[PDB]
Write a protein that binds this ligand. Structure first.
Ligand code: MG
Ligand code: MG
Ligand code: MG
Ligand code: MG
Ligand code: MG
Ligand code: MG
Ligand code: MG
Ligand code: MG
Ligand code: MG
Ligand code: MG
Ligand code: MG
Ligand code: MG
Ligand code: MG
Ligand code: MG
Ligand code: MG
Ligand code: MG
Ligand code: MG
Ligand code: MG
Ligand code: MG
Ligand code: MG
Ligand code: MG
Ligand code: ZN
Ligand code: ZN
Lengths: 25, 102, 81, 130, 129, 229
RNA sequence: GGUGAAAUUCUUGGAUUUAUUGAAGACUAACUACUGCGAAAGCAUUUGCCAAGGACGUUUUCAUUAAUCAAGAACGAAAGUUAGGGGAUCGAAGAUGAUCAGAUACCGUCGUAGUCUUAACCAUAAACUAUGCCGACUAGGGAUCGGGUGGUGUUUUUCUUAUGACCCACUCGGCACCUUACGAGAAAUCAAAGUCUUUGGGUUCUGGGGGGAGUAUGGUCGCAAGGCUGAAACUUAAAGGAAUUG
């Protein structure tokens, strides 16, 4: 990927992880 | 590798420059790196001056010229033959191409 | 210019160089004995005078200040100090 | 198409450089000359040599050409070089016996301390648009 | 002056259309409104020089039947932001006005030019043909 | 042709008939300050009882070339807009509306390596004509310059434009429309501006552009007849 | 209308044009350049106020008050976020019309959020000269901008001084540019990237093979987006720079 896209995909994964964490808490 | 010393942009001391739009692909490009051409032409071509001159009430009327500055994007101009690739040693020749009309 | 006498170089050269850069620092400005058209009083004025120097007896603008060297009045006559 | 490649040019140049006084204008004469003063395997090659040497003869009779340098044309050089006007252009003769210069070179002459006839005349400091 | 009836040509030429449209000195009322694209069917040659020439001949005939004798030339481009250059057909339209009997005078260009006033169609990166 | 859907939002036959037979011509006359006073001829639909043709006439604007009203070709670049306000019948009489340059001269004067000076002013005339006057200038290469450019510092520009404002205000506030136009036609204001600004910076191609009218008072017929004939 | 072609779309209730006008917001063309300023982001219609600044001139004043700086701060492009005012163009999402094997992509019409503003956030960009700052020295060339010097200089003109604008020479400071190496570099190139094995003028901040990864975790800032800080297990023999020939 472009490093730009890798960063964006990682950001979306972080967003999903934070949503799951907020649901769990 | 540094393609050009002047970065092919020609600012060197302004941080940022206002951008202007291409006339062919409507790309926003900085005004300094905008490879501009002044297109001074007549409203009629050389093949029509005769008919207009003979179809004119004014005998000595001289037809006026149309003026406009053209700001290209770089890709359109490389495509539209107005700007030409050069050999590496000939890149640095800043002077405009020598007038063929000598 | 591999060999030259920096201690005593040619006078035109030092006069050419900028001040604060000669062999010894010496200012280029000077003072002037100026005579006002009105009276016979003689007054001393700096070359690049910054204020409008006037005769003590009478209010007349001997010099008009500018960016560099002060400008004398038309009637006044000056002599180098 | 007939361009007379390397070998005929070299041979002709060497022959003229070496044997100028004994080459002529006629083709067949030069053919026999090149036959006697050069070893040439095939007759066609010698014919080409003769042709280009005749061309060189015509060129040299028109005027001296580059590259080639025989001793006799040095005599034409001697004649042209040795010519000289009897009266010098510089020797204070033309321009009505006047050396026309400006003040600074006059000061130069005086500083050197020698007597020269001068004619001082300042030049306007004006610089035109050119 | 032999009492020439004067008008203005008001030639508007885009890259996709050519407008030959004479009107009076005031310009308020319109004598002829035949369009360059009218004279052709392919719809890709609306701005083709032949279409402009034919529409211009139509305008010249309409003028000579109306009474118009002389015309002032008003060449126009699309103006605004789209383009600043005359349409490819308007030149042949002017030529056809020329070689059609009608007298011509006062040729000028009236392309509306903005003072860099608004955003231009295309976006940042523009057309990507 | 006929690349049409005819999606019309309907008669069997539409009588376009003759649009031009119900139309009549009218000759236009210029104010006396212009030399070749005759202007041209405009067409308009013939009179009807409900709507007066003169009503539609008063309010028309006509563009003319100044050389056409002068005869000389030293004024081919100028562009005078006149206003149709009063009609005598088969002849209509006009009042001054505005001035302009044809775009050709305008872009011709704007060259590179010289900074243009643009000035504006809004001003009431002697009687009531609220006008706005523009002024263009171009810095001139001296007759000796090796300096390729002829740029001017912003302070020079500001003093020059202050002088322009003073000159234009003085010229306009004093005179009326007829006097103002009679001044513009020989463009002596150009000479006055050049003379005043020759002290500050050498100036070239000074002109007066786009004489734009903002407001005109209540119409006076006698004055209009005075400006005519 | 629009295009390579088309179609979506608007139209004899007369669209498109033509003329006048008026409304609303936008931006400041041409001028505009190896030109200016600002710490950087950035800054371009006019003139009035307000304060600020660089440079120059200074036989003016104080006498080390200095440089760089962990900690802490002030600004900080665009996008984004809140609320309130705008609402023209342009326009992510979308709605679609076409190409295409597929095309929710390139092209064409519309079109919300934003684009523009007022307070509050955000603090990231290829925020690039991919060159930290302050000093001294080392090589020539013109130009260019600002300042200051001289010209029995040139025109100007107010009769003439004085200006101003120019011409010549010099000087200070700035953006740069040209040639060259005598030095530098792995070079491409550099007049600083030189004065570095003949290794030391003062200083902050970073990197130690490539991934894993600017990820996990932990703090802290933030309303949120996210920012700052920031690993390792494991895996790999290269990844990469510059130029050369194909
Ligand atoms: Mg590359
Ligand atoms: Mg700076
Ligand atoms: Mg392309
Ligand atoms: Mg689109
Ligand atoms: Mg309509
Ligand atoms: Mg502007
Ligand atoms: Mg400037
Ligand atoms: Mg710190
Ligand atoms: Mg912003
Ligand atoms: Mg809102
Ligand atoms: Mg879409
Ligand atoms: Mg679709
Ligand atoms: Mg749209
Ligand atoms: Mg960063
Ligand atoms: Mg960096
Ligand atoms: Mg930095
Ligand atoms: Mg590692
Ligand atoms: Mg990584
Ligand atoms: Mg955490
Ligand atoms: Mg890399
Ligand atoms: Mg490589
Ligand atoms: Zn383009
Ligand atoms: Zn006194």
């Amino acid at each position: 990927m472009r490093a730009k896209w890798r960063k964006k995909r990682t950001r979306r994964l972080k967003r999903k992880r934070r949503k799951v964490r907020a649901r769990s808490k | 590798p540094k393609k050009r010393a002047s970065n092919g942009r020609n600012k060197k001391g302004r941080g940022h420059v206002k951008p202007v739009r291409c006339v062919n692909c409507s790309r926003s490009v900085p005004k300094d790196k905008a490879i501009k051409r002044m297109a001074i032409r007549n409203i009629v071509e050389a093949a029509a001056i005769r008919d207009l001159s003979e179809a004119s009430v004014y005998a000595e009327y001289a037809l006026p010229k149309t003026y406009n500055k053209l700001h290209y994007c770089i890709s359109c101009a490389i495509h539209a033959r107005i700007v030409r690739v050069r050999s590496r040693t000939d890149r640095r020749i800043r002077a405009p191409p020598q007038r063929p009309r000598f | 210019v591999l060999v030259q006498d920096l201690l005593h170089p040619t006078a035109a050269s030092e006069a050419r160089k900028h001040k604060l850069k000669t062999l010894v620092q010496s200012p280029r400005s000077h003072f002037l004995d100026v005579k006002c058209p009105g009276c016979l009083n003689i007054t001393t004025v700096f070359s690049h005078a910054q204020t409008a120097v006037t005769c003590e007896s009478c209010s007349t603008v001997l010099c008009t200040p500018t960016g560099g060297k002060a400008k004398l009045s038309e009637g006044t006559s000056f002599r180098r100090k | 198409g007939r361009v007379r490649t390397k070998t005929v040019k070299r041979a002709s140049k060497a022959l003229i450089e070496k044997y100028y006084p004994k080459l002529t204008m006629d083709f067949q004469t030069n053919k026999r000359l090149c036959d006697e003063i050069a070893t040439i395997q095939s007759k066609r090659l010698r014919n080409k040599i003769a042709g280009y040497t005749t061309h060189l003869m015509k060129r040299i009779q028109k005027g001296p050409v580059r590259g080639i340098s025989f001793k006799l044309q040095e005599e034409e050089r001697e004649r042209k070089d040795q010519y000289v006007p009897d009266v010098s252009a510089l020797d204070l003769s033309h321009s009505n016996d006047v050396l026309n210069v400006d003040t600074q070179t006059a000061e130069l002459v005086n500083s050197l301390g020698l007597k020269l006839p001068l004619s001082v005349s300042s030049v306007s400091a004006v610089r035109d648009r050119r | 002056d032999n009492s020439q009836v004067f008008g203005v040509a008001r030639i508007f030429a885009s890259f996709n259309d050519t407008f030959v449209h004479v009107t009076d000195l005031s310009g308020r009322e319109t004598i002829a409104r035949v369009t360059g694209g009218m004279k052709v069917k392919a719809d890709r040659d609306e701005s083709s020089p032949y279409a402009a020439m034919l529409a211009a001949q139509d305008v010249a005939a309409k003028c000579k039947e109306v009474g118009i004798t002389a015309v002032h030339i008003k060449i126009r481009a699309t103006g605004g932001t789209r383009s600043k250059t005359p349409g490819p057909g308007g030149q042949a339209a002017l030529r056809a006005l020329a070689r059609s009997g009608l007298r011509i005078g006062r040729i000028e260009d009236v392309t509306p030019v903005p003072s860099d006033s608004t955003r231009k169609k295309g976006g940042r990166r523009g057309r990507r043909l | 042709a006929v690349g049409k859907n005819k999606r019309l939002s309907k008669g069997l036959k539409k009588r376009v008939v003759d649009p031009f037979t119900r139309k009549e011509w009218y000759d236009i006359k210029a104010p006396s300050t212009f030399e070749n006073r005759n202007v041209g001829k405009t067409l308009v639909n013939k009179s009807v009882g409900l709507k007066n043709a003169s009503d539609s006439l008063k309010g028309r604007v006509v563009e003319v070339c100044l050389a056409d009203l002068q005869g000389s070709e030293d004024h081919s670049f100028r562009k005078v807009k006149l206003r149709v306000d009063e009609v005598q019948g088969k002849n209509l009489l006009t009042n001054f509306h505005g001035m302009d340059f044809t775009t050709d001269k305008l872009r011709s004067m704007v060259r590179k390596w010289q900074t243009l000076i643009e000035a504006n002013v809004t001003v009431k005339t002697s009687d009531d004509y609220v006008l706005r006057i523009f002024a263009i200038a171009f810095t001139r290469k001296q007759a000796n310059q090796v300096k390729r450019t002829s740029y001017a510092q912003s302070s020079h520009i500001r003093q020059i434009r202050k002088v322009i404002s003073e000159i234009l205000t003085r010229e306009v506030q004093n005179s009326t429309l007829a006097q103002l136009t009679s001044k513009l036609i020989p463009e002596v204001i150009n000479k006055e501006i050049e003379n005043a600004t020759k002290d500050i910076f050498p100036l070239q191609n000074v002109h007066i552009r786009k004489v734009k009218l903002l407001k005109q008072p209540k119409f006076d017929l006698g004055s209009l007849l005075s400006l005519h004939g």
